[PDB]
Amino acid sequence: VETISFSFSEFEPGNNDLTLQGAAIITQSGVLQLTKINQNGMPAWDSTGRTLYTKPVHIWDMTTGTVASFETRFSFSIEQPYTRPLPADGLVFFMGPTKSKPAQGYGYLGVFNNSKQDNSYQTLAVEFDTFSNPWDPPQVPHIGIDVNSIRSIKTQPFQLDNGQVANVVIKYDASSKILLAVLVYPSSGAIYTIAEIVDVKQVLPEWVDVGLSGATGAQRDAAETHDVYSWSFHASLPE
Amino acid sequence: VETISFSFSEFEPGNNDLTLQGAAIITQSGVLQLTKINQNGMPAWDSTGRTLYTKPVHIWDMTTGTVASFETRFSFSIEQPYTRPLPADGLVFFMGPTKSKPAQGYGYLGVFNNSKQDNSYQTLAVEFDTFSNPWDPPQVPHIGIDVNSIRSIKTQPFQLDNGQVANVVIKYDASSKILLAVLVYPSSGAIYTIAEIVDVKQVLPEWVDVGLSGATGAQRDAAETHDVYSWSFHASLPE
Numbered sequence: 001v002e003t004i005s006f007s008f009s010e011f012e013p014g015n016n017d018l019t020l021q022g023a024a025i026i027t028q029s030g031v032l033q034l035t036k037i038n039q040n041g042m043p044a045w046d047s048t049g050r051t052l053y054t055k056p057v058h059i060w061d062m063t064t065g066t067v068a069s070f071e072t073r074f075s076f077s078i079e080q081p082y083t084r085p086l087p088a089d090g091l092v093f094f095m096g097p098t099k100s101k102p103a104q105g106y107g108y109l110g111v112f113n114n115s116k117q118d119n120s121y122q123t124l125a126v127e128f129d130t131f132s133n134p135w136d137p138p139q140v141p142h143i144g145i146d147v148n149s150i151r152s153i154k155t156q157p158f159q160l161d162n163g164q165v166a167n168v169v170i171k172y173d174a175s176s177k178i179l180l181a182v183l184v185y186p187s188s189g190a191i192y193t194i195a196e197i198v199d200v201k202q203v204l205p206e207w208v209d210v211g212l213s214g215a216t217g218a219q220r221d222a223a224e225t226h227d228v229y230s231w232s233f234h235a236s237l238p239e
Numbered sequence: 240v241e242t243i244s245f246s247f248s249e250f251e252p253g254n255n256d257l258t259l260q261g262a263a264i265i266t267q268s269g270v271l272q273l274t275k276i277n278q279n280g281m282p283a284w285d286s287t288g289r290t291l292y293t294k295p296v297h298i299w300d301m302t303t304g305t306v307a308s309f310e311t312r313f314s315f316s317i318e319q320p321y322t323r324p325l326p327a328d329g330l331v332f333f334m335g336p337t338k339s340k341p342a343q344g345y346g347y348l349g350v351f352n353n354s355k356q357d358n359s360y361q362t363l364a365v366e367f368d369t370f371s372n373p374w375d376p377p378q379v380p381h382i383g384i385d386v387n388s389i390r391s392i393k394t395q396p397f398q399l400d401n402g403q404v405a406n407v408v409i410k411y412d413a414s415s416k417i418l419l420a421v422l423v424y425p426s427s428g429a430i431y432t433i434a435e436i437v438d439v440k441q442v443l444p445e446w447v448d449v450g451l452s453g454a455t456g457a458q459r460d461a462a463e464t465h466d467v468y469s470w471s472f473h474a475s476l477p478e
């Protein structure tokens with residue numbers, strides 16, 4: 001078995017287990033701010049930021065045909081403090097090719113380049129999308145499962161609990177090809193679920209980077225916080 | 240689309256939208272005690288109780304071949320007051336042929352009559368299993384997805400938060416055939432997930448009853464409470 005795992009119950013500035021990209025900072029109090037917070041505490045528009053675990057992850061091996069099962073968990077808050085215009089754009093857990101740099105922002109969430117469906121992306125993602133783009137369902141926020149496209153293969157509306165912490169569980173079972181995600185708000189007790197078939201052998205490269213990305217919007221004050229308080233991950237590739 | 244749904248935020252005695260079977264009772268405080276609680280407040284062993292919603296559910300159609308999607312949610316608690324003997328046996332949400340009566344108790348949970356994998360059972364169930372029988376994985380408690388057999392096709396160990404309230408979400412999406420179940424403990428924030436492919440056409444009759452069942456064990460003090468505080472359900476059959 002090729003097993004890999006990590007776990008941050010909080011973040012600490014400077015620990016090179018994490019590559020920070022774009023606007024992402026780790027505060028002194030241990031919070032990963034994916035998108036820029038101005039000095040008055042308000043979230044800035046036109047901001048993109050990501051973080052990746054600095055170690056590659058073996059997900060499948062094109063010599064044995066085995067596929068790795070895996071699971072990630074994290075806690076985040078999105079606060080939408082502006083009365084106008086509508087908030088944007090969201091945050092996302094993603095798995096893609098290694099050594100990746102941030103892509104386009106706004107509705108592509110720092111992960112995609114366009115609204116194309118394109119096997120060249122080689123990227124799996126679970127999004128928490130706060131702005132309804134032309135390729136989106138009308139309901140926001142929504143969870144979505146993104147396979148080689150910002151146009152999710154499956155979505156699920158959820159109600160924001162503005163500024164509260166949400167717990168996320170994301171799990172892939174290789175044998176059934178099921179990818180599931182759950183969002184829980186302790187503040188309210190609300191529980192949301194989503195699941196779809198995903199053949200990661202046909203999507204992901206053998207090795208992948210895993211990461212979190214956030215983005216705010218393309219006009220002034222179309223913005224929200226994308227703060228992350230903890231992040232764990234476990235992958236296990238059978239022989 | 241053919242639609243049915245219900246939602247009990249608490250339970251009220253004498254309401255005949257619910258059928259109580261075996262030991263099941265509704266207290267004056269709105270709690271559904273699936274298995275018997277003695278006058279001294281301790282749970283009684285050798286006890287089996289169930290509740291069924293009193294309207295059948297149209298889950299699929301042989302002529303059109305359409306299959307309903309559905310979701311159920313409930314809050315329960317299991318209190319295990321003794322450490323010797325081991326507590327038993329558990330509770331379960333189940334879907335099966337109409338007009339059914341309690342089957343065997345103990346590790347069969349009031350739903351099955353023995354351990355065989357038999358298509359004549361015509362029963363689908365999500366179990367919360369507290370005692371490790373010969374057909375069970377060694378870890379208890381565990382969530383299990385039971386398709387025509389108390390021998391689960393898929394299990395997920397979880398840690399009991401003894402005596403505290405758990406929140407369950409179970410969802411079936413017809414197009415993917417994914418059956419998913421989530422357990423959340425608000426007291427601790429723990430989250431557990433389980434999912435598997437189920438084709439309910441090969442499993443269930445076209446019309447089913449839905450219900451809840453609990454059972455305590457086969458020797459003195461091998462017992463635990465099986466209390467349920469709320470229960471909702473929704474199904475939608477395309478047309």
Ligand SMILES: *[C@@H]1O[C@H](CO)[C@@H](O[C@@H]2O[C@H](CO)[C@@H](O[C@@H]3O[C@H](CO)[C@@H](O)[C@H](O[C@H]4O[C@H](CO)[C@@H](O)[C@H](O)[C@@H]4O)[C@@H]3O[C@@H]3OC[C@@H](O)[C@H](O)[C@H]3O)[C@H](O)[C@H]2NC(C)=O)[C@H](O[C@@H]2O[C@@H](C)[C@@H](O)[C@@H](O)[C@@H]2O)[C@H]1NC(C)=O
Pocket residue numbers: 336337338339340342343350351352359360362
């Ligand atoms: C777990 O075991 C339980 C106990 O066995 C099952 O419940 C019993 O299920 C049987 C049906 O298989 C019920 O018996 C029938 O009762 C009806 C109504 O009176 C009779 O008409 C019927 O008899 C006819 O069919 C028989 C063959 O099935 C023929 O042999 C017979 O000639 C008739 O043509 C049958 O009655 C029995 O006939 C044989 C006699 O020797 C016997 O004495 C007589 O009872 C039975 O009433 C029922 N018991 C209870 C407490 O409910 C249970 O089955 C599930 O629920 C029942 C109601 C049905 O819906 C089953 O399809 C269903 O599986 C089973 N539970 C599970 C999940 O397997």
Ligand SMILES: *[C@@H]1O[C@H](CO)[C@@H](O[C@@H]2O[C@H](CO)[C@@H](O)[C@H](O)[C@H]2NC(C)=O)[C@H](O)[C@H]1NC(C)=O
Pocket residue numbers: 101103112113118120121
């Ligand atoms: C997404 O955008 C990036 C940047 O434009 C693309 O990456 C460049 O792609 C070409 C060919 O793949 C390379 O020559 C460049 O060196 C790449 N730049 C970097 C930083 O890697 C990427 O290919 C685009 N992907 C899609 C699907 O459009």
Ligand SMILES: CC(=O)N[C@@H]1[C@@H](O)[C@H](O[C@@H]2O[C@H](CO)[C@H](O)[C@H](O)[C@H]2O)[C@@H](CO)O[C@H]1O
Pocket residue numbers: 085086087088089106107108131133216217218219222
């Ligand atoms: C001033 C103005 O109307 N600008 C709009 C952009 O806002 C808009 O881009 C979108 O902006 C929203 C937030 O408002 C969000 O960030 C979307 O992801 C982003 O695409 C654009 C739409 O094509 O039109 C501009 O004129």
Ligand SMILES: CC(=O)N[C@@H]1[C@@H](O)[C@H](O[C@@H]2O[C@H](CO)[C@H](O)[C@H](O)[C@H]2O)[C@@H](CO)O[C@H]1O
Pocket residue numbers: 324325326327328345346347370372455456457458461
């Ligand atoms: C006295 C004694 O050991 N009796 C045992 C039964 O307890 C046992 O049944 C199992 O008991 C546990 C709880 O103790 C649980 O209820 C199981 O579901 C049940 O099957 C049985 C096992 O074959 O043997 C008796 O002798």
Ligand SMILES: [Ca+2]
Pocket residue numbers: 089107129130131132133136
């Ligand atoms: Ca969007």
Ligand SMILES: [Ca+2]
Pocket residue numbers: 328329346368369370371372375
């Ligand atoms: Ca058992």
Ligand SMILES: [Mn+2]
Pocket residue numbers: 127129136137142144150152
């Ligand atoms: Mn979206």
Ligand SMILES: [Mn+2]
Pocket residue numbers: 366368375376381383389391
């Ligand atoms: Mn079991």
Ligand code: NA
Pocket residue numbers: 316318402403404
């Ligand atoms: Na309690």
